Design an enzyme around this catalytic site. Structure first.
Site, PDB file in Angstrom:
ATOM      1  N   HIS A   1       0.820  -1.227   0.000  1.00 25.30           N
ATOM      2  CA  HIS A   1       0.000   0.000   0.000  1.00 25.30           C
ATOM      3  C   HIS A   1       0.847   1.267   0.000  1.00 25.30           C
ATOM      4  O   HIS A   1       0.300   2.344  -0.199  1.00 25.30           O
ATOM      5  CB  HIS A   1      -0.983   0.052   1.199  1.00 25.30           C
ATOM      6  CG  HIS A   1      -0.310   0.045   2.532  1.00 25.30           C
ATOM      7  ND1 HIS A   1      -0.156  -1.109   3.282  1.00 25.30           N
ATOM      8  CD2 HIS A   1       0.276   1.037   3.244  1.00 25.30           C
ATOM      9  CE1 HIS A   1       0.496  -0.826   4.398  1.00 25.30           C
ATOM     10  NE2 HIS A   1       0.786   0.465   4.387  1.00 25.30           N
TER      11      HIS A   1
ATOM     12  N   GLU B   1       0.763  -8.305   0.276  1.00 23.74           N
ATOM     13  CA  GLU B   1       1.009  -6.980   0.848  1.00 23.74           C
ATOM     14  C   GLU B   1       2.462  -6.590   0.898  1.00 23.74           C
ATOM     15  O   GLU B   1       2.850  -5.737   1.709  1.00 23.74           O
ATOM     16  CB  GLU B   1       0.360  -6.834   2.244  1.00 23.74           C
ATOM     17  CG  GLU B   1       0.059  -5.399   2.661  1.00 23.74           C
ATOM     18  CD  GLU B   1      -0.664  -4.565   1.602  1.00 23.74           C
ATOM     19  OE1 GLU B   1      -1.440  -5.127   0.818  1.00 23.74           O
ATOM     20  OE2 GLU B   1      -0.461  -3.298   1.559  1.00 23.74           O
TER      21      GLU B   1
ATOM     22  N   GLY C   1       1.525   5.112  10.599  1.00 26.63           N
ATOM     23  CA  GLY C   1       2.911   5.552  10.486  1.00 26.63           C
ATOM     24  C   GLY C   1       3.900   4.435  10.739  1.00 26.63           C
ATOM     25  O   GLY C   1       5.088   4.607  10.545  1.00 26.63           O
TER      26      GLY C   1
ATOM     27  N   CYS D   1       3.732   1.329   9.323  1.00 24.12           N
ATOM     28  CA  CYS D   1       3.787   0.315   8.259  1.00 24.12           C
ATOM     29  C   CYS D   1       5.174   0.260   7.612  1.00 24.12           C
ATOM     30  O   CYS D   1       5.852   1.292   7.413  1.00 24.12           O
ATOM     31  CB  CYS D   1       2.745   0.542   7.204  1.00 24.12           C
ATOM     32  SG  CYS D   1       1.171   0.071   7.847  1.00 24.12           S
TER      33      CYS D   1
HETATM   34  C1  LIG Z   1       0.296   1.562   8.307  1.00 30.21           C
HETATM   35  C2  LIG Z   1       0.103   2.469   7.098  1.00 30.21           C
HETATM   36  C3  LIG Z   1      -0.379   3.885   7.428  1.00 30.21           C
HETATM   37  O1  LIG Z   1      -0.351   4.408   8.563  1.00 30.21           O
HETATM   38  O2  LIG Z   1      -0.858   4.654   6.273  1.00 30.21           O
HETATM   39  C4  LIG Z   1      -1.644   5.851   6.368  1.00 30.21           C
HETATM   40  C5  LIG Z   1      -2.823   5.696   7.332  1.00 30.21           C
HETATM   41  C6  LIG Z   1      -1.075   1.283   8.964  1.00 30.21           C
HETATM   42  C7  LIG Z   1      -0.943   0.575  10.300  1.00 30.21           C
HETATM   43  C8  LIG Z   1      -2.284   0.473  11.014  1.00 30.21           C
HETATM   44  C9  LIG Z   1      -3.036   1.784  11.092  1.00 30.21           C
HETATM   45  C10 LIG Z   1      -3.894   1.630  12.337  1.00 30.21           C
HETATM   46  N1  LIG Z   1      -3.103   0.679  13.103  1.00 30.21           N
HETATM   47  C11 LIG Z   1      -2.125   0.124  12.466  1.00 30.21           C
HETATM   48  O3  LIG Z   1      -1.253  -0.539  12.976  1.00 30.21           O
HETATM   49  N2  LIG Z   1      -1.750   0.360   8.033  1.00 30.21           N
HETATM   50  C12 LIG Z   1      -2.804   0.799   7.297  1.00 30.21           C
HETATM   51  O4  LIG Z   1      -3.249   1.934   7.374  1.00 30.21           O
HETATM   52  C13 LIG Z   1      -3.395  -0.171   6.314  1.00 30.21           C
HETATM   53  C14 LIG Z   1      -4.878  -0.281   6.573  1.00 30.21           C
HETATM   54  C15 LIG Z   1      -2.988   0.389   4.958  1.00 30.21           C
HETATM   55  C16 LIG Z   1      -3.695  -0.214   3.751  1.00 30.21           C
HETATM   56  C17 LIG Z   1      -4.475   0.602   2.890  1.00 30.21           C
HETATM   57  C18 LIG Z   1      -5.127   0.081   1.757  1.00 30.21           C
HETATM   58  C19 LIG Z   1      -5.001  -1.283   1.470  1.00 30.21           C
HETATM   59  C20 LIG Z   1      -4.225  -2.099   2.312  1.00 30.21           C
HETATM   60  C21 LIG Z   1      -3.572  -1.570   3.453  1.00 30.21           C
END
Ligand SMILES: */C(=C/C(=O)OCC)[C@H](C[C@@H]1CCNC1=O)NC(=O)[C@@H](C)Cc1ccccc1
Length: 181
Positions: A41, A72, A146, A148
């Protein structure tokens, strides 16, 4: 300094980079040669910002399994002068659980950040913002935005890349060594 701290810090120095794509800030793991891995992503384009400079991407591969399901993980080959320190030997041959893992994050906003995610268990299927995803693992820790791309590590092993969380639990894409052959 003990061996676990020394390993995580040395990962931070040589393999875990602060990066930015159009999707925001991520932790990137350089695995060997010019091959690195990011969460899918993050959508790296033709260039990516790595710490202090814009680096071109020669190639990106989004990993799916044999049923065509999202894993992913995007493997990128970078146009860099440096070869990464080869850490493939620390990545297990199959997707492995662990006890008392640490999540290692390295972003401009969250630099050299250590998160005690604890035990890491098999989870499998995960619906990640509408996207079906396989080969995930789970930790009972309230990871947040933040984080990921963060690297899930335990006793000299590199087992996962953080991809999501539901506010009480965190999930990673499992790593296996054959991905980086
Ligand atoms: C890591 C990516 C992030 O912060 O991106 C902008 C929001 C986050 C980690 C989770 C957020 C809430 N708790 C966590 O640990 N991961 C995501 O936001 C995923 C959902 C990103 C995503 C988006 C679209 C398709 C697949 C995955």
């Amino acid at each position: 300094m003990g061996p676990s701290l020394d390993f995580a810090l040395s990962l931070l120095r040589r393999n875990v980079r602060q990066v930015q794509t159009d999707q925001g800030h991520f932790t990137m793991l350089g695995v060997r040669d010019r091959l690195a891995v990011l969460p899918r992503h993050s959508q790296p384009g033709k260039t990516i910002w790595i710490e202090h400079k814009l680096v071109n991407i020669l190639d990106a591969v989004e990993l799916v399994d044999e049923q065509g399901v999202n894993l992913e993980l995007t493997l990128i080959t970078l146009d860099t002068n440096e070869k990464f320190r080869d850490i493939t030997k620390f990545i297990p041959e199959n997707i492995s659980t662990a006890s008392d893992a640490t999540l290692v994050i390295n972003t401009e906003h969250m630099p050299s950040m250590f998160v005690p995610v604890g035990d890491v268990v098999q989870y499998g299927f995960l619906n990640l913002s509408g996207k079906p995803t396989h080969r995930t693992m789970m930790y009972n820790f309230p990871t947040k935005a933040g984080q990921c791309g963060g690297v899930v590590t335990s006793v000299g092993k590199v087992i996962g890349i953080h991809i999501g969380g539901n506010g009480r639990q965190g999930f990673c894409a499992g790593l296996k060594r054959s991905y980086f052959a």
